[PDB]
Amino acid sequence: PFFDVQKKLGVDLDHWMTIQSAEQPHRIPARCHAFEKEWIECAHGIGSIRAEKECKIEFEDFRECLLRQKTMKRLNAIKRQRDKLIKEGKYTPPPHHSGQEDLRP
Amino acid sequence: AKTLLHQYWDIPEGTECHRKTYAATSIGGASGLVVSAYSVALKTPTSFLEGVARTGRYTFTAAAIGAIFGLTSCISAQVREKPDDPLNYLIGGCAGGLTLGARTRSYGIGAAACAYMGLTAALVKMGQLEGWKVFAEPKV
Amino acid sequence: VAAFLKNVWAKEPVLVASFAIAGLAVILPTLSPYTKYSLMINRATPYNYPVPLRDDGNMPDVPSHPQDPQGPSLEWLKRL
Amino acid sequence: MMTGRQARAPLQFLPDEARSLPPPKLTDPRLAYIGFLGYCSGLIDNAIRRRPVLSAGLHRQFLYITSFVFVGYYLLKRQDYMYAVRDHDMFSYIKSHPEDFPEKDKKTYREVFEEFHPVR
Amino acid sequence: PGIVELPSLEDLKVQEVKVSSSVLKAAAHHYGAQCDKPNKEFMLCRWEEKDPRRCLEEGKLVNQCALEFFRQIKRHCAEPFTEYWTCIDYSGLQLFRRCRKEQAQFDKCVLDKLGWVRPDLGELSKVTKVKTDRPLPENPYHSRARPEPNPEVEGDLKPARHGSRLFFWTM
Amino acid sequence: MMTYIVFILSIIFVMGFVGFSSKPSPIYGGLGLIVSGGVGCGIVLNFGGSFLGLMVFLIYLGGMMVVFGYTTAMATEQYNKVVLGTFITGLLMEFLMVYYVLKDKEVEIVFKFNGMGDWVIYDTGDSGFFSEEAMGIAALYSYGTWLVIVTGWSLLIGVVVIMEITRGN
Amino acid sequence: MSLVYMNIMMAFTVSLTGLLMYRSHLMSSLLCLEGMMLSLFILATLMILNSHFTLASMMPIILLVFAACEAALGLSLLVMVSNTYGTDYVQNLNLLQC
Amino acid sequence: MNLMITLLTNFTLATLLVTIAFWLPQLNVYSEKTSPDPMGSARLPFSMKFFLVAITFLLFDLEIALLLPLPWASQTTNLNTMLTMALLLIFLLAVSLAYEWTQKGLEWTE
Amino acid sequence: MNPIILIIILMTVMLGTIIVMISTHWLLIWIGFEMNMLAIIPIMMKKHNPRATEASTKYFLTQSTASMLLMMAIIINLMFSGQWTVMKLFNPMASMLMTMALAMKLGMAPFHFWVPEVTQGIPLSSGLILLTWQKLAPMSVLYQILPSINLDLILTLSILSITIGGWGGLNQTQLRKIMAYSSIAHMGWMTAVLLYNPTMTLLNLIIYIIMTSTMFTLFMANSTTTTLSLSHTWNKAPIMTILVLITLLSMGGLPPLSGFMPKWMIIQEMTKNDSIILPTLMAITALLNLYFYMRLTYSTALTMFPSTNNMKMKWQFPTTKRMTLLPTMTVLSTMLLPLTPILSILE
Amino acid sequence: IMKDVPGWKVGESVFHTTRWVTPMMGELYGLRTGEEILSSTYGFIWYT
Ligand SMILES: CCCCCCCCCCCCCCCCCC(=O)OC[C@H](COP(=O)(O)OCCN)OC(=O)CCCCCCCCCCCCCCCCC
Ligand SMILES: CCCCCCCCCCCCCCCCCC(=O)OC[C@H](COP(=O)(O)OCCN)OC(=O)CCCCCCCCCCCCCCCCC
């Protein structure tokens, strides 16, 4: 049994912590505020069964923001190809990627 | 344990005796290994040698039961030209029960195991034929 | 009630001092007139950016420049 | 099952929609059976404490019967309300989805065919 | 999925405000007072569009206004400002209270040369209003269509037909 | 190799966990747990959590493992093959996992893990004139009223419980 | 995902297998339990700090407080059984088989 | 960066001093000594008092860990709530101390 | 033990259970669990004998392991979802860890090894508190997370619990161990019917709570902890023998008693989802629970075991125990079958 | 660099949306030397 005492009484005992996109002190944003907001605006009011299938792409984007497996895999592939081309000797790194750029500001 | 059951049921019955026997032996050996693991956990042995002897005995008994059941059921399906028939599985179950009696070296437990595991194997065959569900998914 | 305080202040003065300090600490902030000053000093500290609002046409109160007369004032903080 | 129904207005014994339903009568057979349960509990209470069963403490047995009748009346009100909600949701879902609940083509027995198995 | 679009390297090219942190801190109040309109326009565009590629030109205008502010400082009040940011730059935490005298000298010099008045306390932290001509982003989160809600409850509640319909119970 | 500092610290953490989890003696287990807690606090500090790491040093090590070793000194009177065997095999699985991680830059055991250095996940922006974790902890007295109430009640009840069960009557 | 997550999961698994196989003493079981809590602390703290979840930064403090109260209760129980039997061995806690 | 350099320097200076303090009289060849506590072989008596004061310290240390973020928390806008929660926490500290006091918890190590 | 300290500790146990029931945050679920366990430990050690400390030690170790597994599942769910709302879980590993943590807290087989020893080592009132109140919170948490529960795992745990409970209770002579194995079998039934209709689980939980409370209250009323001391009751108070006879018949699910209704509705629910082998197996296995219940009724009510001489000295005095609510739960656990459609109030 | 591999799109976003996402630290400094990586990521934490 889940007795919703808080909704019956109007108190707010643990809803402030329950999500990351909630009211945070000093208006500090999280890394995945937008993705979580979009996923919540999907799943609200349609139940879990419909929300598990209807706009799953919002949840995939949220999970990709959270854990970042695809970005890590893409960086791994790019760096592996760069290492292979560097060792076989047909790629020269640019000056700005070797610490000789004298950055903008 | 999910892939062992599928690889046992992927072979058509009365077709490949060796592969069916091997799949049944692997399933039996896995069950005997589980039983032996729980036996050496809860009932600790006197030494390492007693524990490994108990493990080998239980695993070999279960593997022999599985091999005998699979070979007998497949042979009976081959001879009778009746692949979809629970009588072949009843014969194989009684053969497995007689093997269990031979391993424990007592006739009465072997005869009781013949009757009960032949009935159980027949029930499993009827469930495979009629599509009975044991862990049924929620539907309503 | 009156001789009890004298006896307990002659016998355990440390506990009398502790309880008196505790009572002062628990009844004084509800009585002082400077708590509201702490409230509006803490709420007037600019931690993050004052993001501007797009001028639709009806905001007489919102200034168009920091030196404009309209807007919150901290002269009370400068004087106190 | 019905938590989506009992989720917008939580922790309510009887919502405001329940008052549109007929209340149970005070001569309800279920209410009379619950009063009999209360009387039986009063008699057991007399029996376990070595009192005369049918004579000792008539006020105690009356309070037993009254308490059982009160709690049973409110439980019966809730039960009737929840079965009403079940039927209401069922009929609304049947009416809202006519494609999934087609009208069965009823046929008389002169057209249908049934195999005959003789008993001999 | 899609291909992320980036501006070309010529579009990111601008001449910079090549001054240190203490030089920026010494004239921070006058920079906030004098160059407020393009800064607030850029900040409104930034908080509304949520995309730096849509605020590149406003940032360019911010750079131009800051550069003209420092050119106007250099024309008339180079020496008192130089002393002020020097004594600001000596401090480890870069305190404003260790350099009150040079601050007053710089403020007086720039008041009688350029007519500039420094803001008081709380003035630069005010929320202002911005008149701009670029239209409001109607969909800045790039959100797609929301799922349709379930049908709700309608109609009066009626008693159950033949009661519970649980086995033999007639209620 | 300096970009892999948090990874190396995590290796030391899990190695100390293997060492103290082999149970050689309760006091040596306490020493290994103290070392592992120090290395884990180093991990948290290198990730940016100064307050949480200093809580680990102040409360876990300086305040609680003292009680554990203090109780260990009041029992287990002062003066194996199994301990060495499990320590060796735990070191073997650990270094096999490290080799399989670093050879292919990807691994799967239960979840999928990536073998690149863990500096990639960091945030490119600044937090302004405050630290985010300190504000999050400081919001306990303003937001976490209920959390404060239940935690304080549990602590007082724990004092009462400990006084109750050690009396013997 | 990241790598230090894998190392903290493996540390938790090592401490769990240490707890779940007693050797001789109850104190070693308590040490394995508290190492499990420490691994939970590190994992949750790293996730919360990397995710920039500001309001979740109070959670590891509450976790530490509650599990240290748990450990105080466990130490009291260990002291009670040591006073009963003269040692904290787990083979003396076998009266309830019958 | 500089902090762990300083930590390593302090650790290696301490271990250098300890190594010289140990192994320098080891180079002396003084003598061999046979040497054949007031209690000879008595078991350590288990005292509930020392364990009780240890556990009381641990619990008060936990409530100290709760009390620690007060200087940061005093900067909140909700000052009434923060003041009430702080006073409630220190009042719970005082109540636990008083319960230990009254039930003879602080007895013979007062 | 002080009456006031006992009152505060009991309200702390109920406060922990309430905190688990009403909260929408996983950390608050964890906090309520530790508050409940920390407060209930001194109820077990009320008498201060070595058996109580041994039972308390085993209970503490099991609950701490289950709690650490629960925190692991919560942290994994936070890692893979970024939130803490008590609802369906977003990882199969987190779901498996949480399901096994709740199974360890409930004492279902094969995590059942702590239940009979712990129940034997503690008094009858604390054992009643444990086996009745401690199971309200894990079943509520299971009631909140059913979209994420693996069906094979929970059904395996259920059938294992039922078989192991029946086979374990076949051999016992102490009443507390019998009650523990009976509890294990009933939680097997409750989590068997969980994924199809949790309202049936709530109904079974309520009926089992009432029946267990009645049996334990009769046990402390007669101050009996063994089979033979219970068999002495016919020469002291035969009305109690009649009450334990009807309650033990109702505990076995024999119609028309109120214990028939939970398994009747569970079998009704399981056959709607085309699961026929499992309800038959569970009924055939519950025949074993009926067997040792009927053995108890043989020893207590339907025969007259020999008594001793001092029973006369016990005849000369009346009872003064506060048998609280004993007639009410005695009536409610036997004659509630005609009010079977009352289960619609739990939906 | 990414030219020899078949089926590789240069600049393909990993997300299903066209909303701007704040770049990772490994997305910016991933193709540079280790000294700049150390000075950017651990530079503030290690600073005294
Ligand atoms: C309400 C205010 C806020 C309260 C919360 C914050 C409190 C802060 C201080 C925390 C103190 C914690 C410990 C308190 C222990 C008190 C009980 C006690 O020690 O009683 C015993 C003592 C007599 O000593 P004895 O029995 O011999 O013990 C050996 C030591 N001699 O007994 C005594 O010495 C008598 C102690 C009780 C009477 C003290 C009266 C003090 C009055 C001061 C003026 C009024 C202050 C305003 C508050 C109202 C106080 C009633
Ligand atoms: C969806 C459901 C949600 C939740 C719904 C509500 C659930 C209610 C669960 C009730 C659980 C009861 C737990 C056990 C009793 C608690 C009170 C207690 O502490 O009793 C023990 C106490 C010990 O005192 P002592 O004197 O030491 O006793 C030894 C004998 N001389 O005192 C005694 O021993 C005194 C002797 C008499 C004790 C009688 C206790 C009866 C309690 C159960 C009543 C019936 C169940 C509740 C109503 C129906 C709920 C479904």
From Swiss-Prot, chain F:
Localisation per UniProt entry: Mitochondrion inner membrane
InterPro entries on file: ComplexI_Subunit6, NADH_UbQ/plastoQ_OxRdtase_su6, Nuo/plastoQ_OxRdtase_6_NuoJ
Membrane topology value: Multi-pass membrane protein
GO cellular component: mitochondrial inner membrane; respiratory chain complex I
GO molecular function: NADH dehydrogenase (ubiquinone) activity
Lineage top rank: taxon: Eukaryota
Pfam families assigned to the protein according to its UniProt record, in alphabetical order: Oxidored_q3
Spans traversing the lipid bilayer: 1-21, 25-45, 47-67, 82-102, 143-163
Chemical reaction(s) catalysed: a ubiquinone + NADH + 5 H(+)(in) = a ubiquinol + NAD(+) + 4 H(+)(out)
Top EC class of this enzyme: translocase
Keywords on record: Electron transport, Membrane, Mitochondrion, Mitochondrion inner membrane, NAD, Respiratory chain, Translocase, Transmembrane, Transmembrane helix, Transport, Ubiquinone
GO terms (BP aspect): mitochondrial electron transport, NADH to ubiquinone; mitochondrial respiratory chain complex I assembly
EC number(s) from the headed UniProt entry: 7.1.1.2
Family of this protein: Belongs to the complex I subunit 6 family.
Record-linked PANTHER family: NADH UBIQUINONE OXIDOREDUCTASE SUBUNIT ND6, NADH-UBIQUINONE OXIDOREDUCTASE CHAIN 6
Function in brief: Core subunit of the mitochondrial membrane respiratory chain NADH dehydrogenase (Complex I) which catalyzes electron transfer from NADH through the respiratory chain, using ubiquinone as an electron acceptor. Essential for the catalytic activity and assembly of complex I.
Oligomeric form and interacting partners: Core subunit of respiratory chain NADH dehydrogenase (Complex I) which is composed of 45 different subunits.
Name of the protein in question: NADH-ubiquinone oxidoreductase chain 6
UniProtKB/Swiss-Prot annotation, chain G:
Keywords: Electron transport, Membrane, Mitochondrion, Mitochondrion inner membrane, NAD, Respiratory chain, Translocase, Transmembrane, Transmembrane helix, Transport, Ubiquinone
E.C. number(s) listed in UniProt: 7.1.1.2
One cellular component term from this protein's GO annotations in UniProt: mitochondrial inner membrane
Membrane topology category: Multi-pass membrane protein
Subcellular location: Mitochondrion inner membrane
Reaction(s) catalysed by this chain's protein: a ubiquinone + NADH + 5 H(+)(in) = a ubiquinol + NAD(+) + 4 H(+)(out)
GO molecular function: NADH dehydrogenase (ubiquinone) activity
Biological role stated in the UniProt entry: Core subunit of the mitochondrial membrane respiratory chain NADH dehydrogenase (Complex I) which catalyzes electron transfer from NADH through the respiratory chain, using ubiquinone as an electron acceptor. Part of the enzyme membrane arm which is embedded in the lipid bilayer and involved in proton translocation.
Organism of provenance: Ovis aries (Sheep)
Entry keyword annotation includes Mitochondrion: yes
GO biological process: ATP synthesis coupled electron transport
Transmembrane regions: 1-21, 29-49, 61-81
InterPro entries, alphabetized: NADH_UbQ_OxRdtase_chain4L/K (IPR001133), NUOK/Mnh_C1-like (IPR039428)
The keyword Signal is annotated on this UniProt entry: no
Gene3D superfamilies according to UniProt: 1.10.287.3510
UniProt cross-references to PANTHER family, sorted A to Z: NADH-UBIQUINONE OXIDOREDUCTASE CHAIN 4L, NADH-UBIQUINONE OXIDOREDUCTASE SUBUNIT ND4L
Quaternary data: Core subunit of respiratory chain NADH dehydrogenase (Complex I) which is composed of 45 different subunits.
Name listed for the protein in its UniProt record: NADH-ubiquinone oxidoreductase chain 4L
UniProt similarity note: Belongs to the complex I subunit 4L family.
Swiss-Prot record, chain H:
Record protein name field: NADH-ubiquinone oxidoreductase chain 3
GO cellular component, one term: mitochondrial inner membrane
Family as reported in the entry's similarity comment: Belongs to the complex I subunit 3 family.
A single GO BP: mitochondrial electron transport, NADH to ubiquinone
InterPro entries listed in its UniProt record: NADH_UbQ/plastoQ_OxRdtase_su3, NDAH_ubi_oxred_su3_sf
Transmembrane segments: 3-23, 50-70, 79-99
Quaternary data: Core subunit of respiratory chain NADH dehydrogenase (Complex I) which is composed of 45 different subunits. Interacts with TMEM186. Interacts with TMEM242.
Catalytic activity: a ubiquinone + NADH + 5 H(+)(in) = a ubiquinol + NAD(+) + 4 H(+)(out)
UniProt KW keywords: Electron transport, Membrane, Mitochondrion, Mitochondrion inner membrane, NAD, Respiratory chain, Translocase, Transmembrane, Transmembrane helix, Transport, Ubiquinone
Pfam families found in the cross-reference section: Oxidored_q4
GO MF term list: NADH dehydrogenase (ubiquinone) activity
Taxonomic lineage of the native organism: Eukaryota, Metazoa, Chordata, Craniata, Vertebrata
Cellular localization per UniProt: Mitochondrion inner membrane
Job of this protein: Core subunit of the mitochondrial membrane respiratory chain NADH dehydrogenase (Complex I) which catalyzes electron transfer from NADH through the respiratory chain, using ubiquinone as an electron acceptor. Essential for the catalytic activity of complex I.
Mode of membrane association: Multi-pass membrane protein
The protein's enzyme class: translocase
Enzyme Commission no: 7.1.1.2
Chief location bin: mitochondrion
Keyword Oxidoreductase: no
Signal sequence segment: none
Biological source species: Ovis aries
From Swiss-Prot, chain I:
Record keyword Isomerase present: no
A GO CC annotation given for this chain: mitochondrial inner membrane
Entry's Gene Ontology BP terms: mitochondrial electron transport, NADH to ubiquinone; mitochondrial respiratory chain complex I assembly; reactive oxygen species metabolic process
Reaction(s) catalysed (UniProt annotation): a ubiquinone + NADH + 5 H(+)(in) = a ubiquinol + NAD(+) + 4 H(+)(out)
Membrane topology, from the record: Multi-pass membrane protein
EC number(s) from the headed UniProt entry: 7.1.1.2
Main location: mitochondrion
Disulfide bond entries: none
Pfam families: NADH_dehy_S2_C, Proton_antipo_M
Keyword annotations: Electron transport, Membrane, Mitochondrion, Mitochondrion inner membrane, NAD, Respiratory chain, Translocase, Transmembrane, Transmembrane helix, Transport, Ubiquinone
Gene Ontology MF annotations: NADH dehydrogenase (ubiquinone) activity
InterPro entries: Complex_I_Subunit_2, NADH_DH_su2_C, NADH_UbQ_OxRdtase_chain2, ND/Mrp_TM
Cellular compartments annotated: Mitochondrion inner membrane
Chain segments annotated as transmembrane: 3-23, 25-45, 67-87, 96-116, 122-142, 145-165, 178-198, 200-220, 237-257, 274-294, 325-345
The keyword Electron transport appears for this protein: yes
UniProt family annotation: Belongs to the complex I subunit 2 family.
Task of the protein: Core subunit of the mitochondrial membrane respiratory chain NADH dehydrogenase (Complex I) which catalyzes electron transfer from NADH through the respiratory chain, using ubiquinone as an electron acceptor. Essential for the catalytic activity and assembly of complex I.
Oligomeric and partner information: Core subunit of respiratory chain NADH dehydrogenase (Complex I) which is composed of 45 different subunits. Interacts with TMEM242.
Protein name per UniProt: NADH-ubiquinone oxidoreductase chain 2
Annotated source species: Ovis aries
